[PDB]
């Protein structure tokens, strides 16, 4: 599924991500924009052989099982395919664990490089929320 900007904001709010760990909704929408362009089916292979999955590009090295990332962990206790679904519940639940791990949203490289320090409220501006 390719979400619209306000549609994704609304779904993230319904799943409790707005202000989670102190990160306003625009931070989460901005991160999804630059991680996946709002496409739940996005996948990208990393040089180390791990793969990033879904709207928030969650990595199989630590967070989900894809069966092809040796020596990796599965800290969200989910198959990585669950992170590609049109319903964002699994991605949100796993993102909540990631952002609680100590480094906040710096876990998402695109957030650090393209969202952090910017006017992230622009990503939810105009949306009926
Ligand atoms: Cl957009
Ligand atoms: Cl915001
Ligand atoms: Cl594996
Ligand atoms: Cl959803
Ligand atoms: Cl933080
Ligand atoms: Na894994």
From Swiss-Prot:
Per the entry, what this protein does is: Lysozymes have primarily a bacteriolytic function; those in tissues and body fluids are associated with the monocyte-macrophage system and enhance the activity of immunoagents. Has bacteriolytic activity against M.luteus.
Fetch the PANTHER family from UniProt: LYSOZYME C
What the entry lists under Pfam families is as follows: Lys
Location (main, coarse): secreted
Q: State the organism named in the record.
A: Gallus gallus (Chicken)
* Subcellular localization(s) per the UniProt record: Secreted
Active site: which residues? 35, 52
Q: Name one GO cellular component term.
A: endoplasmic reticulum
Q: Which gene encodes it?
A: LYZ
- Matching CDD domains, A to Z? LYZ_C
Tell me where in this chain the C-type lysozyme domain is found. 1-129
Share what the entry says about its subunit structure, partners included: Monomer.
InterPro entries named in the record: Glyco_hydro_22, Glyco_hydro_22_CS, Glyco_hydro_22_lys, Lysozyme-like_dom_sf
Source organism, top-level taxon: Eukaryota
Ligand binding (substrate) = 101
Q: Which reaction does it catalyse?
A: Hydrolysis of (1->4)-beta-linkages between N-acetylmuramic acid and N-acetyl-D-glucosamine residues in a peptidoglycan and between N-acetyl-D-glucosamine residues in chitodextrins
Query: What protein name is recorded for this chain?
Result: Lysozyme C
Q: Name one GO biological process term.
A: defense response to bacterium
Which GO molecular function terms does the record list? beta-N-acetylglucosaminidase activity; identical protein binding; lysozyme activity
Q: What is its EC number?
A: 3.2.1.17
**Where, if anywhere, are coiled coils annotated?**
none
- Give yes or no: UniProt keyword Translocase: no
Q: What class of enzyme is it?
A: hydrolase
SMART domains in UniProt:
LYZ1
Q: What is the additional note?
A: Lysozyme C is capable of both hydrolysis and transglycosylation; it also shows a slight esterase activity. It acts rapidly on both peptide-substituted and unsubstituted peptidoglycan, and slowly on chitin oligosaccharides.
Tissue and organ distribution: In the egg white and polymorphonuclear leukocytes.
Record's keyword terms, sorted: Allergen, Antimicrobial, Bacteriolytic enzyme, Disulfide bond, Glycosidase, Hydrolase, Secreted, Signal
- Entries under Gene3D superfamilies matching the protein: 1.10.530.10
């Amino acid at each position: 599924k390719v979400f619209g900007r306000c549609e994704l904001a609304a779904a993230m709010k319904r799943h409790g991500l707005d202000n989670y760990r102190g990160y306003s909704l625009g931070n989460w929408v901005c991160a999804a924009k630059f991680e996946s362009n709002f496409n739940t089916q996005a996948t990208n292979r990393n040089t180390d052989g791990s793969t990033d999955y879904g709207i928030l590009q969650i990595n199989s090295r630590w967070w989900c099982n894809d069966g092809r990332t040796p020596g990796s962990r599965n800290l969200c206790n989910i198959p990585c395919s669950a992170l590609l679904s049109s319903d964002i519940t699994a991605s949100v639940n796993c993102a909540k664990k990631i952002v609680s791990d100590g480094n906040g949203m710096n876990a998402w490289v695109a957030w650090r490089n393209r969202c952090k320090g910017t006017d992230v409220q622009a990503w939810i501006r105009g949306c009926r929320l």
